[PDB]
Design a protein around this ligand. Sequence first.
Ligand SMILES: *P(=O)(OC(C)C)OC(C)C
Ligand SMILES: *P(=O)(OC(C)C)OC(C)C
Ligand SMILES: *P(=O)(OC(C)C)OC(C)C
Lengths: 191, 191, 191
Amino acid sequence: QMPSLAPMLEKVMPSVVSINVEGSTTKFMALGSGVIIDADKGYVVTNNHVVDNATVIKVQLSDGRKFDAKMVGKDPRSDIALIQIQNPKNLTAIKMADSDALRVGDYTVAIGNPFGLGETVTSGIVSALGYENFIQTDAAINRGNSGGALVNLNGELIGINTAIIGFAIPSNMVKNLTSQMVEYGQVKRGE
Amino acid sequence: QMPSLAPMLEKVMPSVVSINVEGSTTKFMALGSGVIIDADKGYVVTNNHVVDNATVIKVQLSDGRKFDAKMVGKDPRSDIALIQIQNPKNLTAIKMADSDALRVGDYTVAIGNPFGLGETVTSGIVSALGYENFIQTDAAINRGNSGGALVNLNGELIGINTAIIGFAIPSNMVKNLTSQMVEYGQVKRGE
Amino acid sequence: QMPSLAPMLEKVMPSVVSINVEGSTTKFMALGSGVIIDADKGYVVTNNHVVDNATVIKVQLSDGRKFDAKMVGKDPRSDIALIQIQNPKNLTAIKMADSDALRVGDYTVAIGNPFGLGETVTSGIVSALGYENFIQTDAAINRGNSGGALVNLNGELIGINTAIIGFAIPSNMVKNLTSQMVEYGQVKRGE
Ligand SMILES: *P(=O)(OC(C)C)OC(C)C
Ligand SMILES: *P(=O)(OC(C)C)OC(C)C
Ligand SMILES: *P(=O)(OC(C)C)OC(C)C
């Protein structure tokens, strides 16, 4: 009856996972949110500040299924990391959108795991586009605990939220980075 | 012409009252917001942290009419209290909605009395549903001064905002609690 | 395809300029946002806390064109000041709306220059209307760096944001003040 984001979120959530890290750096237990970017390979994109110095990475799908995961790549620069699910089965990958098509007045939605109690959704608009970090929005407060996905009304990934209003690495940037991790195990800066 | 919440708020506001407390605890003057939950009896639901240790409770309707009120019940647990208007006349009660029907992407509106200058309205969506406190939303910042009603687009009460993003006791929870106060003068926990 | 404020913002932005001050008070470099209120005269309205104690005022249009500007009036009271562009050419003035027509549930948009990296847009609704400062909204957080324009869905100026949720001097108030500066070089309080 009344307008709601519930419908689209019902399509997106299956791509959003929750991360539980147990590493060290001379214990230490961090926790975060992630997005399945490749269903067959089980490629989950996330914040580097969550999986950094991890000994054990655990992933849980919105349906409640739990999996193990391993690091495949990371980049302190953008706070973007890539993990891979162990024995992935029946996974749903988010569809990425063309960041370049983003306009400021655009409505965005941020999904995350701020307390480890599950997923939290917030809304806003694109505040600024083209300090650093390509995307800025009021849809996600600048929290060192707020990462996760940045999605548009069509439920497509426009960016990944990170900590330094909020800043997110735009999806095109994320595609380029992560894929670069898959092939090189790391992101090679240019010249 | 342009979309606005003004229309629905014009229907809801008559159910929203403003509370002015004057108690003690060995003066002390607190102030808050409330919602008329029963028009005939003049049952106004509110935050316990506002009416706690009250000697004198005063209520003012959005039309400007002032009334006296007495405590009927309270519950430190959920920050929910119930007061009753003295000699209530021509009152409007809010219609409660089924909390269980709540979905995250849902739009919500919070109404309150943050400065004693009148009512303040803010909007957001249901961030999280099923730490504690059943409802979480970005429509009301986590303020020890922000309580009041949590309403949906149809102008129905979905919860009462309280202090520990924001957390609200869902309406079904509120119904159960308050009614329990009416009959027992207090809320009896289970086993 | 999807609803967005981008269309209307595309019409409004040309009226929004960015201010760069270089004054003193025994250097000192401040920066802010402004709104072209008169295209022929090049009258730009802004916050007093930005142009106060200015030796040099510089303005840059959203298209990138830069201009010099001089003070014509100011008012510490409301944090409203008026500057005039030197040799103004092909300027666009914002259309002001009737503040008196404002209702609380109304959607608003705030435009500003919080970091000097360009314009930042945020959205919200009118929280409170009729402490001080006529307009209150969640569309602009209470920031000593957040000033700029307060606009409605039709892209009309309903107020100017200022620092003391957010507070803005309503447009009618702004019209009265600024015009009073043009004629008297200052705002003469009444009796
Ligand atoms: P975050 O900026 O905010 C939580 C702390 C409520 O946004 C998340 C949902 C990505
Ligand atoms: P609160 O969380 O915020 C005020 C301090 C602006 O929300 C009220 C309107 C319930
Ligand atoms: P401000 O209250 O917020 C920035 C600090 C993000 O709003 C501006 C855009 C007027």
